[PDB]
Amino acid sequence: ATVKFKYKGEEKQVDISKIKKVWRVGKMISFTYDEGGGKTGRGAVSEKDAPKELLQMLEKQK
């Protein structure tokens, strides 16, 4: 599965494996995906824009 964001009509895309951490703050949702250079590319996607299999990691306990 993959998650897509939405910044000013700019639907972004990042593989779930490319992502690193994910934590929903208040109502929106944020995370840290590795762009591919050296600086972590943080991102703030919305709750409706996030798929349904994304909160899974937030409630994934081993």
UniProtKB/Swiss-Prot annotation:
UniProt lineage: Archaea, Thermoproteota, Thermoprotei, Sulfolobales, Sulfolobaceae
Record-given protein name: DNA-binding protein 7a
GO MF, one annotated term: DNA binding
PTM statement from Swiss-Prot or TrEMBL: Lys-4 and Lys-6 were found to be 60% monomethylated.
Organism expressing this protein natively: Saccharolobus solfataricus (strain ATCC 35092 / DSM 1617 / JCM 11322 / P2)
Enzyme class: hydrolase
Xref: InterPro entries: Chromo-like_dom_sf, DNA-bd_7a-e_arc
Enzyme Commission number: 3.1.27.-
Gene designation per UniProt: sso7a1
Assembly, per entry: Homodimer.
Positions bearing N6-methyllysine: 4, 6
Role played: Can constrain negative DNA supercoils. May be involved in maintaining the integrity of the genome at high temperature. Has RNA endonuclease activity with a narrow substrate specificity; the cleavage products are 3'-phosphooligonucleotides.
Pfam families with a match to the protein in the record: 7kD_DNA_binding
Domain of life of the organism encoding this protein: Archaea
Family membership: Belongs to the 7 kDa DNA-binding/endoribonuclease P2 family.
Alphabetic keyword roster: ADP-ribosylation, DNA-binding, Endonuclease, Hydrolase, Methylation, Nuclease
